[PDB]
Short mmCIF file of C-alpha atoms in Angstrom, two decimals:
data_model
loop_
_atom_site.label_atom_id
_atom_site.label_comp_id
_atom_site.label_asym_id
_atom_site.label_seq_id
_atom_site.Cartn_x
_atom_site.Cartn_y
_atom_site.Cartn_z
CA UNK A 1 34.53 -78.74 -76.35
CA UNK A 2 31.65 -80.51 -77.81
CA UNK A 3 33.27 -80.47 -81.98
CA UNK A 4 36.28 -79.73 -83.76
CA UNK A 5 34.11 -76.43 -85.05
CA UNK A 6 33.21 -75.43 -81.48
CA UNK A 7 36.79 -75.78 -80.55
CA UNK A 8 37.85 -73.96 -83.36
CA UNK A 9 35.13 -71.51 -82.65
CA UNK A 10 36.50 -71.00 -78.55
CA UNK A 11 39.89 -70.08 -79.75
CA UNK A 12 38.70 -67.67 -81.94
CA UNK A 13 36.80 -65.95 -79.66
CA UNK A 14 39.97 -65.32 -77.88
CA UNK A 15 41.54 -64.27 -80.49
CA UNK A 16 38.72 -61.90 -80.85
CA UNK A 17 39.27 -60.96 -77.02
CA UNK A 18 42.56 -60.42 -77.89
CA UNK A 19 42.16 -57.96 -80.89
CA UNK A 20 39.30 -56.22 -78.12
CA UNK A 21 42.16 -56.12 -75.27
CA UNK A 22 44.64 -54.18 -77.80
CA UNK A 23 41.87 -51.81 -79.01
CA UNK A 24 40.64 -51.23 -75.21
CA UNK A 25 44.72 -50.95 -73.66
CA UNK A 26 45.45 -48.81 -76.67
CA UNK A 27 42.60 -46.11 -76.28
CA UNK A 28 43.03 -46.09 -72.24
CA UNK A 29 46.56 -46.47 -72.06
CA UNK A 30 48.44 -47.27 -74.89
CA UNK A 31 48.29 -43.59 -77.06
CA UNK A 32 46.85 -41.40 -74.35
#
């Protein structure tokens, strides 16, 4: 990682993937 900020910024893009996984695995799988 180039910066503190960018490295900041990478993990929270996968915490954003994360909060994307649950919303995808709950409408396909999780409540249906």
């Amino acid at each position: 990682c180039s910066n503190l900020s960018t490295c900041v910024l990478g993990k929270l893009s996968q915490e954003l993937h994360k909060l994307q996984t649950y919303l995808a695995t709950n409408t396909g799988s999780g409540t249906p």
